[PDB]
């Protein structure tokens, strides 16, 4: 019943007959331009002039501690053109029968109805059998860009890699996280048109794969409060111009109700333990003495933030006043009266 | 020297982090700020887009329910505020890659005969124009009340500028901010310095409760196909590319420049997304200039010579013509 | 004089984060390249140092992209600007596969050689402003230090190698076990340790530098997992370092 | 030029924020406001819909469980206040995309013309008085004694309106207000200005402890069912969308105008839900009134050059398949 189909697939004006000859003329002219790989190039970047693939066969050593392609699942090969302009093979063994099962095995095993089929509707079956069961597996020649290259320090000295993706090893990974419950991704970053250019069977049927989920705990994630912890506030009361400094050391009684103010409506519900605060630096002290005309603190004066550090507040030169002792034991002891 | 090498490579000197947006008040805007969170909607519109006039006919009376995102000042807050900073690296220190010898010892010798000839300064002064005049704000400039822009290096804090008043078309070098940042910038540039900090902030007065617009991101999925917005630390932000595009929108020199008079950012064909069209599809463009200056040898236009170093600045894979 | 060197809280920002199977964590060929790297750039420096062995603390993350309302993930990709080769002048380009992450770290590098003192700390603190990691920036660090005890290490989660746990699983195929052991215990992550060897060493036409040894490679996954700095059993039992055999470029742990 | 390009969009030139709900007392009106929320409540149907007489027998006396949520006022205040706000913007000003510079060209051509001939006067008047008579409103406009308007600009407080006085069908161009008002909203349409900040604030006498209708959240069939209202910063409010819907309302121009005599929103194909039947179906739409218009260059009558600017005035997105 592949007659249907193959009159399906035409899409031309031409009889029913000439539609099977623009078929079948295509075929046997594009089976030696398809090759057999298992890590065909292209998929990171179909840029890649040629068809570079490596068609590792070697498989042993279940044991080990790593995990690649060969030794695990690995039960259909990559049959892969040049091109998209001749991808008739892969289309052509694709397809299913009412049986059950995939035209390549038929090939394989030849099965005695396919085979009358194709004497009816062809005489150059044997040629197509012959091309297809023992297709050539070619050697990665040569290298370009679009191919990822690092360096490696092997002993003293240096290699060169040539990463290639299995895409085999993609496609089965996809089918297993299918029927399966670990967290993964769908990563949709394709199209049919650049599939089709890569020139990959595999990857021209599996278009957007299965991926694996590998990330750090829930509890390890940015947000908003994680974000606004690293921030601080700094008081709106500029002393550089308020009246009454004196150099910048509180000089007046009646001003220090409008520090406890500030400092009172600014650091509620904003307690934090010593690892969230920020750190007072003796730095930042001595850069506002040497900015202020000052080397070490005047007699009778101890430094002060006005917005506590302990209440989200920050080290700088504008969260910094320098006032008398008994200032500094009532604002205290009226910061500690509010908070604790 | 026959031609180009098959593997060479540079990268950007000129590196952005990603933009966060918060809002304030004008008059305190130096002391706090606010987060700007971004708000998921749904609306329901009609079926206005053009259609073939068969399913016009049933389908004009349809209701069309869609997702979307947007974000929105609050009602008390009346000025954003963006922050980002750049990074500065030489650019003769940037050539990742280069398979060849006597290619590699050209360029370096051409780009020596370039900082000897002129310093880097023209496409620094560029640069730093692009900052002042605040052309990152692509859609919330417009209607804006008052920009405000603060450069910082490492602790010297520059005057500030005021983007209103500068034109997006001309270029202005009598500034002594200006001069001084293109100085180090292009100091950087040469080689003289190992690698430069700059911290940006402005504050733009669009109104009360007024829209603002962060970076939209570009996602695929089968179910959804909404607006989603940029969502940086929980806050909105802007991409680091969309910011890097404003920045290097200093092209001039590129032909029939007298029947546009705008800049354009620059591309290895002068290609815009604006315009639609690409203004170097000739013998202007990087690969035909970089071919007869190293292959040839020939001294170009001094406007040439900005180009390709404006090229070089932003990096890509200059190789050679890849074969089977 | 050997010692240890801690760089504290450092942030990278759109940081390679797709293998071929793999997309979070970047590889920790990446991380270990990124040592060699900055070894590489003080040698040719003044100041002559090694490294071997280092250790990752993670502190924060964010993948780039959104959350689904079922939970997944839906990564986002930059625009493509332009692409070299066929097709190189219209305005749209061909999308591939693609994937980034923000994430905040700490680094714990086993330094050995003369002069391990501040003045190293210092130059590394010079020279690492010119570098990469995993393909991502560097934006702000918080200090390096020189630490020689454990208790001085911030609190975070190391990442380490549990190819036991794989190797502890049913299944003929390590696919399988793979599968299982990821079933079983839901701490444990796959992660990319290496590269096997695809072909033997020889010289090609058109690589990066056309003096070194040429060999087609594959991508190496095993299992990993996380545990607390304050936990933890010993310096030592944290590190990561290279392997060499007959193409088995790979990082373990020993 | 032969076509429209590949990729053309119109952003929008009248921005209008989200409105915010506050409840008061009409004697203090200009003391005092309080927040309004939003309450759950459950309820119970008892099948009252059209069913088939198959399962109707068996499944009439069932009860009906679903929820929703409601907002009335409270018992002391009767007045509804409404804040919100306008941003104009240039109309040349609003070409995002466009991918060919002939077109630009003649567009730019066009909309000189246009400024040459009638400065954006009409449009702005129809605008303020769509404003002025508080469509806004919709259902809270029903059942209400008292509705006043007040517009202010920068500082200078516009006189107040009675909106009740107004029709919802004629278009009064004749007050000092409006006409003041609309003289610098066509300054900002034209280009004299770069910008233009209006505030509205709307006070509603409706009742004590009456019901109010803030908007509706639209709901997929994917989280759950319900009826949800908007809440905008804790209060109810209402959908920056839906108010710019009212003020749109300025088309008179359409075909069959005076089988039916009323304004229409401004729309592609002239769709208006009030009445079911689409006004601009075929060569009077959009589409094909802007290629005789720019492609073929042809004189239109100045009705159909109101509707054209009323389109590119909202915006939207007028690319072309090639």
């Not at chain 1, 829930?218 to 150099?247: H, R, T």
């Not at chain 1, 005047?298 to 700088?316: K, N, R, T």
């Not at chain 3, 210092?122 to 630490?147: D, F, H, P, Q, W």
């Not at chain 3, 340790?193 to 991508?219: I, T």
């Amino acid at each position: 019943m592949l007659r249907n189909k193959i009159l399906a697939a035409i899409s031309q004006k031409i009889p029913e007959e000439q539609k099977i000859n623009k078929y079948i003329e295509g075929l046997f002219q594009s089976i030696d331009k398809n090759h057999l790989a298992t890590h065909v190039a292209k998929f990171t970047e179909t840029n890649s002039p040629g068809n570079i693939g490596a068609y590792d066969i070697l498989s042993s050593d279940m044991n080990c501690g790593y995990l690649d392609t060969a030794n695990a699942g690995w039960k259909e090969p990559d049959i892969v053109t040049n091109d998209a302009k001749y991808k008739r093979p892969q289309g052509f063994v694709a397809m299913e029968m009412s049986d059950g099962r995939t035209v390549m095995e038929h090939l394989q095993e030849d099965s005695a109805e396919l085979r009358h089929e194709m004497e009816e509707l062809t005489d150059k079956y044997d040629e197509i059998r012959d091309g297809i069961l023992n297709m050539p597996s070619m050697q990665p020649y040569r290298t370009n860009q679009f191919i990822k290259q690092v360096f490696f320090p092997v002993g003293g000295s240096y290699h060169l890699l040539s990463i290639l993706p299995s895409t085999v090893l993609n496609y089965e990974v996809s089918d297993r996280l299918y029927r399966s419950k670990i967290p993964k991704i769908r990563l949709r970053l394709l199209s049919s048109n650049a599939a089709s250019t890569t020139g990959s069977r595999l990857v021209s049927k599996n278009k957007w794969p299965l991926v694996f989920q590998a990330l750090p705990p829930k509890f390890l994630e940015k947000n908003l409060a994680k974000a606004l912890d690293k921030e601080y506030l700094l008081p709106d009361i500029n002393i550089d111009e308020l009246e009454g400094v004196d150099n910048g050391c509180l000089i007046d009684e009646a001003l220090l109700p409008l520090i406890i103010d500030e400092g009172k409506r600014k650091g509620e519900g904003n307690y934090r333990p010593r690892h969230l605060r920020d750190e007072r630096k003796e730095e930042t002290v001595q850069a506002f003495l040497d900015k202020y005309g000052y080397c070490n603190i005047p007699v009778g004066y101890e430094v002060h933030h006005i917005v506590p550090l302990s209440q989200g507040g920050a080290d700088s030169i504008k969260n910094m006043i320098m006032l008398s002792i008994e200032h500094h034991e009532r604002v205290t002891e009226a910061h500690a009266s509010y908070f604790k | 020297l026959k031609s180009r090498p098959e593997n060479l490579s540079f990268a950007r000197c000129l590196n952005t982090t990603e933009a966060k947006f918060w809002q304030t008040d004008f008059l305190k805007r130096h002391t706090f700020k606010l987060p700007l969170l971004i708000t998921d909607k749904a609306v329901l519109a009609s079926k206005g887009h053009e259609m073939p006039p068969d399913k016009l006919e049933k389908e004009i009376m349809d209701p069309n329910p869609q997702k979307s995102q947007s974000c929105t000042l609050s009602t008390e807050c009346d000025t954003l505020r963006i922050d980002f900073g750049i990074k500065v690296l030489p650019v003769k220190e940037s050539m990742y890659s280069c398979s060849d010898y006597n290619y590699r010892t050209a360029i370096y010798q051409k780009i020596d005969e370039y900082i000897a000839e002129d310093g880097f300064l023209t496409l620094a002064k560029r640069y730093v124009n692009n900052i002042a005049n605040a052309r990152f704000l692509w859609r919330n400039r417009k209607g804006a009340e008052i920009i405000e822009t603060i450069v910082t290096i490492e602790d010297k804090e520059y005057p500030s500028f005021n983007s209103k008043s500068f034109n997006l078309d001309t270029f202005v070098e009598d500034n002594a901010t200006i001069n001084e940042i293109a100085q180090q910038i292009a100091d950087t540039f040469a080689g003289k310095r190992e690698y430069l900090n700059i911290y940006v902030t402005c504050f733009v007065k669009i109104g009360c409760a007024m829209e603002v617009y962060p970076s939209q991101e570009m996602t695929f999925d089968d179910d959804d196909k909404g607006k989603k917005l940029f969502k940086f630390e929980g806050s909105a932000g802007m991409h680091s590319q969309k910011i890097n595009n404003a920045l290097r929108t200093i092209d001039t020199w590129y032909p029939d420049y007298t029947t546009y008079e705008f800049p354009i950012p620059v591309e290895n064909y002068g290609a815009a997304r604006s315009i639609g069209i690409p203004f170097r599809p000739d013998t202007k463009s990087f690969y035909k200039l970089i071919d007869r200056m190293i292959l040839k040898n020939e001294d170009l236009p001094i406007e040439d010579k900005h180009y390709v170093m404006a090229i070089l600045i932003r990096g890509g894979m200059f190789s050679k013509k890849q074969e089977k | 004089m050997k010692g240890y060197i801690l760089l504290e809280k450092v942030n990278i920002e759109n940081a390679n984060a797709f293998n071929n199977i793999i997309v979070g964590i970047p590889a920790i060929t990446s991380f270990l390249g990124f040592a060699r790297a900055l070894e590489r750039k003080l040698n040719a420096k003044e100041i002559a140092i090694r490294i071997n062995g280092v250790g990752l603390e993670f502190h924060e993350y964010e993948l780039k992209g959104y959350k689904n309302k079922r939970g997944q993930y839906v990564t986002s990709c930059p625009l493509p600007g332009s692409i070299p080769g066929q097709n190189e002048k219209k305005l749209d380009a061909h999308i591939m596969n693609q994937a980034y992450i923000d994430l905040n770290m700490s680094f714990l590098l086993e330094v050995e050689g003369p002069h391990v003192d501040m003045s190293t700390c210092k130059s590394i603190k010079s020279t690492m402003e010119t570098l990469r990691i995993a393909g991502g920036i560097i934006r702000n660090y918080k200090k390096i230090r020189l630490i020689d005890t454990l208790a001085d290490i911030p609190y975070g989660y190391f990442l380490t190698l549990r190819q036991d746990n794989l190797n502890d699983a049913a299944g003929d195929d390590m696919l399988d076990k793979m599968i299982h052991a990821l079933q079983q215990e839901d701490t444990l992550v796959p992660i990319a340790v290496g590269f096997k060897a695809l072909s033997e060493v020889g010289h090609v036409e058109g690589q990066r530098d056309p003096e070194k040894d040429h060999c087609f490679v594959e991508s190496i996954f095993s299992l990993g997992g996380f545990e607390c700095s304050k936990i933890l059993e010993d310096i030592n039992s944290c590190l990561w370092r290279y392997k060499t055999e007959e193409g088995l470029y790979l990082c373990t742990i020993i």
